[PDB]
Amino acid sequence: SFRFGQHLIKPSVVFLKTELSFALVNRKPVVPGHVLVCPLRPVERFHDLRPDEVADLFQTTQRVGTVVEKHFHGTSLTFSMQDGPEAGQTVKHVNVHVLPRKAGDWRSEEEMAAEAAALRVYFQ
Amino acid sequence: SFRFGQHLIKPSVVFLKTELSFALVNRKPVVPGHVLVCPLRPVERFHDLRPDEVADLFQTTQRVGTVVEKHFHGTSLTFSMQDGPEAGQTVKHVNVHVLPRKAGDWRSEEEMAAEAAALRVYFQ
Ligand SMILES: Nc1ncnc2c1ncn2[C@@H]1O[C@H](COP(=O)(O)CP(=O)(O)O[P@](=O)(S)OC[C@H]2O[C@@H](n3cnc4c(N)ncnc43)[C@H](O)[C@@H]2O)[C@@H](O)[C@H]1O
Ligand SMILES: Nc1ncnc2c1ncn2[C@@H]1O[C@H](COP(=O)(O)CP(=O)(O)O[P@](=O)(S)OC[C@H]2O[C@@H](n3cnc4c(N)ncnc43)[C@H](O)[C@@H]2O)[C@@H](O)[C@H]1O
Numbered sequence: 001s002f003r004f005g006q007h008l009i010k011p012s013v014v015f016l017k018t019e020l021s022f023a024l025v026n027r028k029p030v031v032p033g034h035v036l037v038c039p040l041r042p043v044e045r046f047h048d049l050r051p052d053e054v055a056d057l058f059q060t061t062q063r064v065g066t067v068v069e070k071h072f073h074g075t076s077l078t079f080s081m082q083d084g085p086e087a088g089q090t091v092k093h094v095n096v097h098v099l100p101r102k103a104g105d106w107r108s109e110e111e112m113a114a115e116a117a118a119l120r121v122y123f124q
Numbered sequence: 125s126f127r128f129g130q131h132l133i134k135p136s137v138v139f140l141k142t143e144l145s146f147a148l149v150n151r152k153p154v155v156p157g158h159v160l161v162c163p164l165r166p167v168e169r170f171h172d173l174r175p176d177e178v179a180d181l182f183q184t185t186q187r188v189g190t191v192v193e194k195h196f197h198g199t200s201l202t203f204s205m206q207d208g209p210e211a212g213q214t215v216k217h218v219n220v221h222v223l224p225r226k227a228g229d230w231r232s233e234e235e236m237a238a239e240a241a242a243l244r245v246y247f248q
Contacts, residue, residue: 046186046189046201046203047186047189047190049186051179051183051186054179054182054183054186055175055178055179055182055183057182058178058179058181058182059175059178059179062170062171062173062175062178065170065171065207066171074208074210075208075209075210076207076208076209076210076211076213077170077205077207077208077211078204078205078206078207078211078212079170079204079205079207080202080203080204080205081201081202081203081204082202083189083200083201083202083203083225084198084199084200084201084225085199085200086198086199086200086225086226086227086229087200087201087202087225088202089200101207101208101210101211102210103210105210
């Protein structure tokens, strides 16, 4: 019941949801704990975001990171937004990639829902 | 009169300044128009930012990008924050890297002040 470009994201893999943004797990994380934060409204370019959704997108992005860094035992975070077709954007929806980091660094929907469930505990 | 870790940034190379953040040019941009946006207060990890400075850091980051994308003729933006020593952070100050993007992609302080001056026109 979450739009992410032209796909619908089953709540099962969504682990946080604010008034304006939401965060979810990946089918192929680049690193354990690689997750995403996207505004609820489907805009394709970061510049299309009202300034309230931008505050919200990154206050949420701040929070989500503190948790996966904890949860997945990282010591540093890597944040990044691929904003446009020439920046590598594949899904035309704004979305921050949050990747926990460590010194020297595909799955089933159920493994995704398991992971989202664990992440939901930290936002309780 | 701008702190960026343990260095002082001469206003000459600063091209925007809000109540909470500020943006500046690079001595070695990775791509023409690669610039930075940093909170005025020197925190070393994104999580150390109040939520007001986070709204401000990214509302500002939204603006700055729209301009360098225009100015440097890009068609897409790449945003990214290296948050921690294991994420590649070199300067222990929070700072978003904004890089304009195009299909298939060191200088003197004066060349830096020239560039900041041009960027200041778009925020007039
Ligand atoms: N050395 C290094 N190597 C790699 N990354 C590094 C690095 N250093 C720093 N970084 C860091 O690693 C990041 C590089 O990641 P990236 O920007 O290359 C991933 P993307 O696939 O291009 O993303 P988008 O198209 S925008 O967004 C689409 C995303 O949503 C997901 N998605 C789409 N549909 C989905 C669905 N239905 N269900 C679940 N997920 C879906 C996709 O899997 C995809 O990840 C940077 O932040 C950098 O600082
Ligand atoms: N294929 C690709 N290749 C490269 N980047 C890509 C990519 N695809 C996407 N990206 C994109 O390119 C970016 C990768 O850039 P990066 O994160 O590797 C640069 P950094 O030097 O590690 O940054 P920091 O330590 S955090 O911050 C320090 C910064 O402040 C500057 N600085 C420090 N002191 C200064 C001073 N006194 N005066 C002026 N500037 C100063 C430094 O030059 C430095 O750039 C990503 O956003 C990605 O999405």
